[PDB]
Design an enzyme around this catalytic site. Structure first.
Site, mmCIF file in Angstrom:
data_model
loop_
_atom_site.group_PDB
_atom_site.id
_atom_site.type_symbol
_atom_site.label_atom_id
_atom_site.label_comp_id
_atom_site.label_asym_id
_atom_site.label_seq_id
_atom_site.Cartn_x
_atom_site.Cartn_y
_atom_site.Cartn_z
ATOM 1 N N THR B 1 16.779 4.093 20.595
ATOM 2 C CA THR B 1 18.000 4.792 20.452
ATOM 3 C C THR B 1 18.703 4.682 18.858
ATOM 4 O OG1 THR B 1 18.570 4.238 22.635
ATOM 5 C CG2 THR B 1 20.411 5.210 21.293
ATOM 6 N N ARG B 29 15.861 8.363 35.683
ATOM 7 C CA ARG B 29 16.707 7.163 35.223
ATOM 8 C C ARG B 29 17.551 7.494 34.009
ATOM 9 N NH1 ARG B 29 17.590 4.151 30.425
ATOM 10 N NH2 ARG B 29 18.400 2.370 30.709
HETATM 11 N N1 LIG Z 1 20.194 1.770 25.383
HETATM 12 C C1 LIG Z 1 18.812 2.535 25.781
HETATM 13 C C2 LIG Z 1 17.770 2.049 24.911
HETATM 14 C C3 LIG Z 1 18.025 1.248 23.497
HETATM 15 O O1 LIG Z 1 19.047 1.567 22.999
HETATM 16 O O2 LIG Z 1 17.099 0.393 23.114
HETATM 17 C C4 LIG Z 1 18.542 2.706 26.933
HETATM 18 O O3 LIG Z 1 18.552 1.804 27.623
HETATM 19 O O4 LIG Z 1 18.853 4.125 27.468
#
Ligand SMILES: N[C@@H](CC(=O)O)C(=O)O
Ligand SMILES: *[C@@H]1O[C@H](CO)[C@@H](O[C@@H]2O[C@H](CO)[C@@H](O[C@@H]3O[C@H](CO)[C@@H](O)[C@H](O)[C@@H]3O)[C@H](O)[C@H]2NC(C)=O)[C@H](O)[C@H]1NC(C)=O
Ligand SMILES: *[C@@H]1O[C@H](CO)[C@@H](O)[C@H](O)[C@H]1NC(C)=O
Ligand SMILES: *[C@@H]1O[C@H](CO)[C@@H](O)[C@H](O)[C@H]1NC(C)=O
Ligand SMILES: *[C@@H]1O[C@H](CO)[C@@H](O)[C@H](O)[C@H]1NC(C)=O
Ligand SMILES: N[C@@H](CC(=O)O)C(=O)O
EC number: 3.5.1.26
Lengths: 161, 141, 141, 161
Positions: B1, B29
Site C-alpha cells: 500500500t 476481503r
Molecule cells: N494495509 C493493507 C496492507 C498493507 O498496507 O501492507 C491491507 O491489509 O489491506
C-alpha cells in the site's frame, strides 16, 4: 514548517514526485494525492499497489483505495473494486459525484464504468504464477480457522466444524 | 500500500491510499486502506495520517484517526504516531504496522512496531527546503 | 439500523449492528454500520457505543470510537455521547444521527442531533434494575 | 449500574427481549448481540433492518452488519451482503472462521453459502413497489451530484458533464 509537503509510505520516489509535479502546476492537494497514488498503480509498487499482484484465494486481484478532502472532510472510497485498474481514480469519482463514502465489489465496477473507467482483467501471468505455487503449497498461508479440512494443512472449500 | 499525505501551501490537507490487499486473502476481503480514519484520515484543523501493515488488526484501532486526535492536542507527529503504535502493541505484541503523521504546519514523523523481521520504516518526504524527494527512516519501537 | 451494546455479567462487552442501509442508495454502497469505530465499538477496558443515522456523514467522524475514547479518558457515558454529537454537529448542523454510550461498570446514555423533525431519541434498556426492558428518550442537542 | 446490560438503538422491544434471553440462558455478550440483531432482521424493524426494505437504485436490498468482541477486540463484518437474510449471522462467522474483519458484496455471499446460509432473494413485493414509485417520481431522492442529467430532476444513467 516549509510548505507545501508530501509524505508517502515506503521508498516510492516516482510517486512522491508525481505528487509534487501536481502541486508544481498549482494542482490541489487532492489532485496531488490522486496522482501520486495512481502512479503506483501503473508501477504496481512492490506488487502491493495496483493490478497483477496479491491475488485472493480464487486468484483474482481486488483493489481498495480512498482519498479524503481535508477541508470538507469528504471521502471517496472503493473496497473490493473488481476489473478496474485506476482504483484511486474511481475513489475521487465517489467523492466528486455521489454523497456517499464507500462503494464496493462488482457494483463499484458498474459505477466506475459509468464514470468512464475501462473494465479489464487485473490478472497477469505473474499474478497467477503466484496463485498456482500457493495451491501447490496447500494454500499456506491462508486466513481461515475452525473449519474442516484443517486450514493449516489443506486447501478448501472448507465447512464449519 | 501507498499511504500518502499532502499539505498544499494554502494549508489545505489531503490523504489517500491504494492497495491490492494482503496475499491470498479470502474472496471479497477489504481491509483498513479504504476505511476513512483507519487507512488514512485528514483534517484541516489538525493534520493527517496514513497507515500501512496488517489491515485486519489495524482497522480495529483506527490508527490514522487517533494519530490525528493526538496532533489535535498539539502532540508532535512522531509522538502521536508513536503513541498509536503503542496502543495496538499492548493488544497484539507482534503486529505489522507503520504510520506516517504530519500536523497542520508541515511537521512530519512516523512510527512502527518492532518485529524481528521489521526493524526500520522508510518513507519519502517532499518539501521546499530540500526540494528533491528525500527518503526518511525510523527505527521501530 | 439496529445498534446494540451488551455487557455480560462477568464484565465482558460486545457491540454490533445490522441494517439494510439508507433508502435508494447507489448500488454497492456501504455505510458506517459494518465499520469498526463508526457503527459500533466495544472495549472491555473502556466501554462501548453505537451510532445510527446518516451513515455517509457519520462514518467520517468515527462516533463510536470517540465515544469509547472519551469514556476511556474517564467521562460520563452521556457526556461522552453528547460531545461526539457536538463535534459532528459543528461540521453538519442538520445531520441525522444518534448514539448510545455505556461504560464498563454498566452506566449508559445517549445523545442526538436536534432537527426540526427529530427532537427525541428513544432507545431500549434492559437491566437487572428492572427485569423488563424499558424505553428511554433523550432530548436532542 | 448492575449487570448484565443490554442497550440498543430505537424502541425495538423485541430485540432487547431476544438479547436478554440469550444472557439468561448462559449466553455471552456475543450471543446476546447476535440474538438482538438477528431478531430485527426477521421482524424487519422499521424496514431499516433486514430484507425487503431500503432498495438501492436497481431495486435490490443489500445488508450491512457487524459484531465486535470487546475482550479480544476482534470483529466480524459484512457489507453489501447479497442474497443472505441473516446478516449478523454471517458477520459472526467472519469473526470466528477468519482472521479478516470485513468481507463484502457477492464475494461475501459465497462465504455465507460455504457457512451454511441459504442463498435467497431479499426482495418483497413491498420493496419491489417502493422502488417503482421511486422510479415514477423520476428517481427522487437519490445521492448523486455534479452529473447530467440533473439529479435534482431526472433519473439516471448519470455521467460527468
Ligand atoms: N494495509 C493493507 C496492507 C498493507 O498496507 O501492507 C491491507 O491489509 O489491506
Ligand atoms: C460509569 O459512569 C458513571 C456515571 O458517570 C460513574 O459513576 C459515578 O462515579 C463517581 C466516581 O465514583 C461518583 O461521584 C463521586 O461522588 C463521591 C461521593 O462520595 C465524591 O466523593 C466525588 O467527589 C464524586 O462526586 C458518582 O456518584 C457516580 N455516579 C453514578 C450515577 O453512579 C462511574 O464511575 C463510571 N465508571 C467508570 C469505571 O468510569
Ligand atoms: C520509477 O520506479 C520504478 C520502480 O522500481 C522503476 O523501475 C522506474 O525506473 C522508475 N521510473 C522512472 C521514470 O524513473
Ligand atoms: C507541528 O509540530 C511541531 C513539533 O511538535 C510543533 O511545534 C508545532 O507547533 C506543531 N503544529 C501545531 C499546529 O501544533
Ligand atoms: C414486538 O412484539 C410482537 C410479539 O410477537 C412482534 O410482532 C413485533 O415485532 C413487535 N410488536 C410491536 C407492537 O412492536
Ligand atoms: N446507519 C444506517 C442508517 C440508519 O442508522 O438508519 C446507514 O446509513 O447505513
Amino acid at each position: 514548517s516549509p510548505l507545501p509537503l508530501v509524505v508517502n509510505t515506503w521508498p516510492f520516489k516516482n510517486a512522491t514526485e508525481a505528487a509534487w509535479r501536481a502541486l508544481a502546476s498549482g494542482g490541489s492537494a487532492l489532485d496531488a494525492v490522486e496522482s501520486g497514488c495512481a502512479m503506483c498503480e501503473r508501477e504496481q509498487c512492490d506488487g502491493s499497489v495496483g493490478f497483477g499482484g496479491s491475488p485472493d484465494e480464487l486468484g483474482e486481484t481486488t483493489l481498495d483505495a480512498m482519498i479524503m478532502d481535508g477541508t470538507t472532510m469528504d471521502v471517496g472510497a472503493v473496497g473490493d473494486l473488481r476489473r478496474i485498474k485506476n482504483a484511486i481514480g474511481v475513489a475521487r469519482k465517489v467523492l466528486e459525484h455521489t454523497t456517499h463514502t464507500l462503494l464496493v465489489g462488482e457494483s463499484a465496477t458498474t459505477f466506475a464504468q459509468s464514470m468512464g473507467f475501462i473494465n479489464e482483467d487485473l490478472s497477469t501471468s505473474a499474478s497467477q504464477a503466484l496463485h498456482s505455487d500457493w495451491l501447490a503449497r496447500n494454500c499456506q498461508p491462508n486466513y481461515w480457522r475452525n473449519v474442516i479440512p484443517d486450514p493449516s494443512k489443506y486447501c478448501g472449500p472448507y465447512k464449519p466444524p | 500500500t501507498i499511504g500518502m499525505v499532502v499539505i498544499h501551501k494554502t494549508g489545505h490537507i489531503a490523504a489517500g491510499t491504494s492497495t491490492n490487499g494482503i496475499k491470498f486473502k479470502i474472496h471479497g476481503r477489504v481491509g483498513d486502506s479504504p476505511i476513512p480514519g483507519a487507512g488514512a484520515y485528514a483534517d484541516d484543523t489538525a493534520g493527517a495520517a496514513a497507515a500501512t501493515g496488517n489491515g485486519d488488526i489495524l482497522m480495529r484501532f483506527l490508527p490514522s484517526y487517533q494519530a490525528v486526535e493526538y496532533m489535535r492536542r498539539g502532540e508532535d507527529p512522531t509522538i502521536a504516531c508513536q503513541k498509536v503504535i503503542s496502543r495496538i502493541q499492548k493488544h497484539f505484541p507482534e503486529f505489522f504496522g507503520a504510520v506516517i503523521c504530519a500536523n497542520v504546519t508541515g511537521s512530519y514523523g512516523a512510527a512502527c512496531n518492532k518485529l524481528s523481521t521489521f526493524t526500520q520504516f522508510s518513507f519519502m518526504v517532499y518539501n521546499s527546503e530540500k526540494n528533491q524527494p528525500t527518503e526518511e527512516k525510523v527505527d521501530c519501537i
